[model samples]
Target: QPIFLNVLEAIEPGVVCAGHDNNQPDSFAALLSSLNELGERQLVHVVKWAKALPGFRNLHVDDQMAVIQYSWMGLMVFAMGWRSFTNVNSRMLYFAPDLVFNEYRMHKSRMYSQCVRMRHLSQEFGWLQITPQEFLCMKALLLFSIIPVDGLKNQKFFDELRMNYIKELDRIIAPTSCSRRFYQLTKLLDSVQPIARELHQFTFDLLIKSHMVSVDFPEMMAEIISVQVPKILSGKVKPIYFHTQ
Candidate 1:
């Protein structure tokens, strides 16, 4: 109980800045290039955080990497939503302290609709009154939320790990209202999938014409977008949604 929560809080990665230069006027290329850099930087932290998660190492080496790659977008977006909620009261996107997305930035980024969805997701944090422990557990569960349609290298291990994480979420909620809270949380988790899909599509298109638009994608982000993201977009990889769509 306390042990699990302690480990989660202890290993949680510290604040990451997007390194955006606010002094320079925001433009499409400038904002996107900075966001790409942020994605790359956040990815390194995600790998470290995932490896530190309890039972993550028990997964087959390939499966571990696969799960991390597939789920990174959702994990980052969900955590960003929490950051936005806590830091700005969901007034704007807290991509980073320096790179917060205000109305103009959202519009300039050319992903205005996607930004709106993400902000709505940020608002959900306050609306749901999600606890920190609950956030950590749900975030961990996100790592196992997507996989190749066929299966992971060790699907059985992944399934068990996911089940344990779900149980931990259940344990964290108060017993008096467990069912209602669980229903709400699961629905909230389910909400992340479609938003992630929209991003996958947007990022894929951005990467395709990145040079044309002068948007610079870091090496890792480029590769993941070119390779893994397409699988998800094409339905080669699929998210495991809690509710039927």
Candidate 2:
């Protein structure tokens, strides 16, 4: 039981946001940049963990990208749902030890409403009694998803992987009436899709708006929001440029 709990802890360690340098400005722009940095690092950690899982690396590169692409937004929502203690009612995502947005900060962008909604949804998700093994299985099911994507290289292979993960999820819930638990779990996953879509769109708009105001978002961050980078920094795509005065 200890080992199982440890695994779950590692997956969603609930790390402190850990505020930036004392000399750094406390402006909303600074906060946005800091938030993006934290997200980028967390994203790397999650991707590395996913890649380390069995059979993930065996898939073709395109299919691999497909899985990551299709599921990453949802995974982010899941991570925020489970890992972040930032949800404090409808105010906004409070980074607890790091930063909490004031009304002005929240008003600086349109994403705040969406963020509040996500926080509330995640709060609801938290109430469901999910086990560690079930969490891992659900993550794998999302990671291996093959729901008729655009450029999935080997759809059949992805299908097999997804089905295997689903079977594992089924096994995890086998102690009880499988249908009820299975339905609940998949329903939880299904609920994530709309929020994920909203998040992606919000991110895209945020990045675009940032470019307009001369607020630079990280290149990788821009890529994550699905914008084409205007320049490559050290072989990595940098955020695109736009002028709106």
Candidate 3:
């Protein structure tokens, strides 16, 4: 067994609760407010988790924060998908134990299409029978999945880190069934980008009109959504897709 896998499992962040009050009636504002709170809570865990990954600290400090900022949405969505698959059998969005999304909440959040896409992603986990080790490796790789078009402050270090993560993912796929399993996992990874893009767009839009809509955004979430997300929406930053698409 690889030490990389051991480290990944050990450093994986524990479950984060959204602090959502289920007693409140589910409305657009209430649901989104809880989601925003959930986003902020998850962000804290994500930073600590990223810092603990093997080779993560070898990159320039600026690049480390940049990668986390750029890829947070994708990473959250992927883990959320896995949570939904394992917890609820892919029947709903298990964003958090306290903030699960049923069909009504999906509609009330005004992100039905995006929710549908995320649910499909959750279903894929069950459909593929992805192991917990594979989930951990893939989630770690998601941290390195996106970057600026101009490259990181220390691109070489970042590149090597990403390459090593991919190697770990390969190691997780058993050699007896490597080719097909590898392709499926890589494709699954690629699929996360588009769903993340949609969320980037949705959250960016929501942040812009948040005051009028009664949605509450946490401070860091507001800053990243306004500053970094625009770069992505404008094509200044992009995901590194495994496939040509």
Candidate 4:
């Protein structure tokens, strides 16, 4: 279903955020700005692929409800990954070794100030040891790739971190598919495909290198929405389940 190290679907648009050079504005800036267009170019095919799924077009409304259930669940996972990635522009985010170290010290200081500090989070985060600029470049490691953020609530701010990427999936799904009863579910997904695809690719290039996922994001997304999601949501009630797919 979803592929890892699959060259066929990994190449994505945009420049890697960590590797971005302000000196090379044309290569990085133009790619960053064209997220919408780049995404749309890929999504133009999703509409065709989606309809190709068996019985996708003929399913009854109630059966369609079952499909919606899984779709809603998938979006939740999608969001978590998105946030974990650094969609932030290079200009918006800077990694100054001095500043970041100082930040780490300050954050740790806050913890040390509180007697509850049990772990050395700064030391564990390798980024803390480097200069602010180097740290900024390496931030792509955490921002571009998967990271773990612990706590449903927080645990003294020293809890073991785990990668987390959850987004506002329900709100997005509801408006387009269910709220107005837009029964053609594929179109809703198709329309949003460009934006969704771009968001993923945008993060890939912004945080990591375009070379990393240069060929596989599209298929991975499809599988996430189709197969992986249903497994995660074996029995969860996603509010917008019946309204959208």
Clashes per model (N, Cα, C within 3 A)? 0, 0, 0, 28
TM-score of each: 0.98, 0.73, 0.98, 0.21
Candidate 2 C-alpha lDDT tens digits along 1-245: 54433444465544646354436545656666766776666667667666766677778876565466556666766666654433554344554346555556556644677666666655655566776567667766666542341335676676677667676677668735677777777877766666765766666666878866555566666685653222111223211111111
Highest-lDDT candidate: 3
The TM-score measured for candidate 4 stands at 0.21
- Writing each residue's lDDT as its tens digit, candidate 4 over 87-125 gives 321111122211111233324322222111111212222
Name the regions of candidate 4 deviating beyond 4 angstroms: 1-23, 26-29, 59-245
Instruction: Please give the RMSD of candidate 1 to the true structure.
Output: 1.0
lDDT of 1 by residue, 192-233 (tens): 999999999999999999989999999999999998999899
Worst 10 residues of 2 by lDDT: 236-245
TM-score (C-alpha) between model 1 and the true structure:
0.98
Winner on lDDT (1 vs 3):
3
Question: Residue by residue across 1-245, what tens digits does model 3's lDDT show?
Answer: 56888888888888899998899888898888889889999999999999999988899999889999999999999999999999999999999999999998899899999999999999999999999999999999999999999988889999899998898887778554798899999999999999999999999999999999999999989999999999999999999999899
- Please tell me which model should have the higher TM-score, number 1 or number 4: 1
- The residue pairs in collision within model 1 are none
